[PDB]
Amino acid sequence: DEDAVPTLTPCRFTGSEIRHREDGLPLAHVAIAVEGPGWANPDNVALQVANAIIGHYDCTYGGGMHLSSPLASVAVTNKLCQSFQTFNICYADTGLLGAHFVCDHMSIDDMM
């Protein structure tokens, strides 16, 4: 004990985007996420399940023609990206769970 044990005053995380702007980045290591678990909220249960419905589309994964995530499917058919992986970023009650990704000059648009 003694002093200095404050709690979490809610606020907004950044809410932005930035490209480390690289011609030198040879191919996109792309990504995205939408709430990932953290400690707290009762919701994430189904959000877990929801993220399940989300799912992670593995580059090394094969079978895209038959892929389950419809996203994954077209991504195969369209050859529409080089990766996406649902990735759950954690803070008690909030976060981001969503795809990593890899792509050339193209995908991101249709990706979203």
Partner 1 sequence: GRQFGHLTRVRHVITYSLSPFEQRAFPHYFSKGIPNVLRRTRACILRVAPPFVVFYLVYTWGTQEFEKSKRKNPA
* Among the listed residues 2, 8, 20, 65, the single contact to partner 1 using CB under 8 A: 20
CB of 46 to partner 1, least distance (A): 26
In angstroms, what CA-CA distances link 73 with 13, 54, 57, 76, 81?
A: 33, 13, 9, 5, 11
Give min distance, CB of 39 to partner 1, in A.
25
DSSP letter (8 states) at residue 57: B
Asked whether position 22 contacts partner 1 by CB under 8 A, the answer is: yes
Instruction: Decide if residue 24 touches partner 1 (CB under 8 A).
Output: yes
Tokens representing 36? Answer: 């990932």
Residue 21 as a binder of partner 1 (CB under 8 A): the answer is: yes
Q: Report, in Å, the least distance between residue 12 CB and partner 1.
A: 8
CB neighbours of residue 72 within 10 Å: 22
Q: How far apart are CA 52 and CA 4, in angstroms?
A: 39
112 is a site residue for partner 1 (CB under 8 A): no
23 in contact with partner 1 (CB under 8 A): yes
